[model samples]
Target: NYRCPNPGDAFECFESDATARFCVSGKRGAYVICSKCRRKYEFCANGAKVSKRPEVECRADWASTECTSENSDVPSVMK
Candidate 1:
């Protein structure tokens, strides 16, 4: 799961974004794919750009990888 830098109930949370990054399988995207297609936000590990919104591209980075999946229906819950 992903978490915002704010630490206590992220006030900067946007309706389109989330604080917990999904940790599933084969899921790749800029935002963390949490339960129900939620895009959780997290501090970018790239050490550049503000995490209020992640600006670093994560196509080649695994740390940025929040979730994955072999198939969408293979799991009952994101794990």
Candidate 2:
């Protein structure tokens, strides 16, 4: 299943003019995807942005399953 964190559609986040964007994929770990200037940013464990890169992408495979809501919290900066 493939899912995107963006609120609307691909690249359509909650705040279009925000400096940062965030979204969570149930298929993936408790990960967040950040985008700035159309460039991908880093991920975070709890709140503070970490340098670790997930082996898999943060997006979902819509063909595999439906997009689900996150059980945990996301970074405040993304909010």
Candidate 3:
């Protein structure tokens, strides 16, 4: 939950024939990225009419300064 602001925005459903499973809902695969935070997230949907938000684990620490690191720099802004 806290790891990512939104799961649905990052993951998308796909068709059944698209990947390992079948998606009867006629969905497509996609990728989403967070602007304020820099990270890559992707996923594939199953064969279902309904889609749920994807779940993800903690990767980077955005709560901390410098996106989690690089806060020790002289400049307040982190690259």
Compared with the true structure, all predictions reach lDDT values of 0.32, 0.32, 0.23
What is the per-residue lDDT of model 1 for residues 1-79, given as tens digits with 9 covering 90 to 100?
4443433442233344333343322223343343232322212221222234343443335236444442111222223
Q: How do the residues 28-49 of candidate 2 rate in per-residue lDDT, one tens digit apiece?
A: 3444443331222122222324
Compared with the true structure, what per-residue lDDT tens digits does model 3 show for residues 1-79?
3332243353322222211211112233312222222221121222122223322221233222222222111122221
Name every residue pair that clashes in candidate 3: 15-23, 16-22, 16-23, 23-47, 24-47
Task: Report the alpha-carbon TM-score of model 2 versus the true structure.
Answer: 0.20
What does the lDDT come to for candidate 3? 0.23
> Number of the top candidate by TM-score?
2
Give candidate 3's TM-score. 0.13
- Candidates ranked by TM-score: 2, 1, 3
Minimum summed lDDT over a 10-residue window in model 1 is located at 70-79
